[PDB]
Design a protein around this motif. Structure first.
Motif, mmCIF file in Angstrom:
data_model
loop_
_atom_site.group_PDB
_atom_site.id
_atom_site.type_symbol
_atom_site.label_atom_id
_atom_site.label_comp_id
_atom_site.label_asym_id
_atom_site.label_seq_id
_atom_site.Cartn_x
_atom_site.Cartn_y
_atom_site.Cartn_z
ATOM 1 N N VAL A 1 -3.171 -3.882 11.944
ATOM 2 C CA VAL A 1 -4.022 -2.715 12.240
ATOM 3 C C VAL A 1 -3.623 -2.145 13.597
ATOM 4 O O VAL A 1 -3.392 -2.894 14.561
ATOM 5 C CB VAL A 1 -5.572 -2.978 12.390
ATOM 6 C CG1 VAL A 1 -6.323 -2.419 11.231
ATOM 7 C CG2 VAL A 1 -5.868 -4.439 12.424
ATOM 8 N N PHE A 2 -3.600 -0.828 13.730
ATOM 9 C CA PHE A 2 -3.193 -0.226 15.002
ATOM 10 C C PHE A 2 -4.328 -0.159 16.007
ATOM 11 O O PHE A 2 -5.335 0.438 15.632
ATOM 12 C CB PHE A 2 -2.640 1.143 14.638
ATOM 13 C CG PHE A 2 -2.334 2.141 15.724
ATOM 14 C CD1 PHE A 2 -3.366 2.808 16.383
ATOM 15 C CD2 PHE A 2 -1.017 2.425 16.003
ATOM 16 C CE1 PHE A 2 -3.073 3.764 17.335
ATOM 17 C CE2 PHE A 2 -0.726 3.373 16.943
ATOM 18 C CZ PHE A 2 -1.741 4.040 17.607
ATOM 19 N N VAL A 3 -4.302 -0.708 17.218
ATOM 20 C CA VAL A 3 -5.399 -0.421 18.135
ATOM 21 C C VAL A 3 -4.875 0.573 19.103
ATOM 22 O O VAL A 3 -3.684 0.614 19.405
ATOM 23 C CB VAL A 3 -5.901 -1.472 19.120
ATOM 24 C CG1 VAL A 3 -6.771 -2.448 18.440
ATOM 25 C CG2 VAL A 3 -4.738 -2.240 19.684
ATOM 26 N N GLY B 1 -10.205 7.375 8.447
ATOM 27 C CA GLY B 1 -10.430 8.742 8.035
ATOM 28 C C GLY B 1 -9.061 9.284 7.628
ATOM 29 O O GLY B 1 -8.187 8.529 7.180
ATOM 30 N N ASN B 2 -8.799 10.576 7.748
ATOM 31 C CA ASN B 2 -7.478 11.109 7.425
ATOM 32 C C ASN B 2 -6.391 10.545 8.288
ATOM 33 O O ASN B 2 -5.319 10.409 7.732
ATOM 34 C CB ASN B 2 -7.377 12.600 7.577
ATOM 35 C CG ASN B 2 -7.888 13.067 8.932
ATOM 36 O OD1 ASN B 2 -8.370 12.270 9.763
ATOM 37 N ND2 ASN B 2 -7.903 14.384 9.156
ATOM 38 N N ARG B 3 -6.435 10.198 9.556
ATOM 39 C CA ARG B 3 -5.250 9.524 10.084
ATOM 40 C C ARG B 3 -5.011 8.097 9.611
ATOM 41 O O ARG B 3 -4.037 7.492 10.037
ATOM 42 C CB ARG B 3 -5.266 9.507 11.582
ATOM 43 C CG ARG B 3 -4.605 10.765 11.980
ATOM 44 C CD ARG B 3 -4.078 10.660 13.368
ATOM 45 N NE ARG B 3 -2.646 10.447 13.451
ATOM 46 C CZ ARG B 3 -2.049 10.478 14.648
ATOM 47 N NH1 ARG B 3 -2.739 10.695 15.750
ATOM 48 N NH2 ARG B 3 -0.743 10.313 14.772
ATOM 49 N N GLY B 4 -5.824 7.487 8.757
ATOM 50 C CA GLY B 4 -5.577 6.119 8.306
ATOM 51 C C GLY B 4 -6.380 5.041 9.015
ATOM 52 O O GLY B 4 -7.121 5.334 9.943
#
Length: 67
Positions: free
Chosen positions: A26-28, A54-57
């Motif tokens: 997961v990106f933090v 959301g839309n950015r993932g």
């Protein structure tokens, strides 16, 4: 919440990655880091977080370094 350790973090540019056991990384971003003190994660720290998308993932939230 969820358990993880942080894969790596670019302290400098403030984003990095938390690998989680079973799922994918997961990106933090520094702004998901809760606590108090300058917002950076050492690689290897054990965060608990939440994933938000959301839309950015999907992206991590409520990253409590442990504060």
């Amino acid at each position: 919440m969820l358990e993880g350790k942080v894969k790596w973090f670019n302290s400098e540019k403030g984003f990095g990655f938390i690998e989680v056991e079973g799922q994918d990384d997961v990106f933090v971003h520094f702004s998901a880091i809760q606590g108090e003190g300058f917002k950076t994660l050492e690689e290897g720290q054990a965060v608990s977080f939440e994933i938000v998308e959301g839309n950015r993932g999907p992206q991590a939230a409520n990253v409590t370094k442990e504060a």
